[PDB]
Structures are given as C-alpha cells and as structure tokens.
C-alpha cells in the first residue's frame, strides 16, 4: 500500500502542465501515505517492544 501511493502520486505529477490539478485523489493519496507511514512506525516500535 505504501508502494502504490508513491507510484500513484508520481504518475499524477507527470500530468500535463495545466491538467496538473489538486483533485481530492491527490488529497487522499497524501493523507494515505502519512497514515501508512505512522502506522508502520507504531508497528515498528511494537516490534522493538516484542
């Protein structure tokens, strides 16, 4: 899921120069990465506690 969101955000950065827009997709695609990352951080610290 982290892999996908970076590839989704990268391709959308190659959208044409006026067609490059701040659609809600971009909004979620960003928030998505944040959650996925902070969730792996919570999972990474629990591996340290385990």
């Amino acid at each position: 899921p982290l892999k996908v969101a970076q590839t989704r955000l990268y391709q959308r950065s190659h959208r044409p120069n006026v067609e490059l827009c701040r659609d809600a997709a971009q909004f979620r695609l960003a928030s998505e990465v944040e959650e996925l990352n902070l969730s792996l951080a919570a999972l990474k610290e629990k591996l340290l506690e385990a």
């Binding site: 120069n17 006026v18 490059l20 701040r22 960003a30 990465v33």
Partner: protein, 38 residues
Amino acid sequence: LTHSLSLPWRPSTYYKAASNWPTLDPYCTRFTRYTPDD
C-alpha cells in the same frame, strides 16, 4: 472538498501555468522536503 492550508505552502506551478494560458481562475485556499534528484 476542502482546500486547507499546510505550513509549507508551494504555489510555484500555478504561476507558470497561467503564464502559458492567462485565462485561469485563482489557485487560492478555501512531505515537507524534496528528493535530492528533484
């Protein structure tokens, strides 16, 4: 949806865009770092 505001604001593109096509509406409101290759 909601056009919120992040503390690092990067409005660069809009400028170049309206530069090639004047006809354009405001890009106003209503990952804090760059890749080294960028």
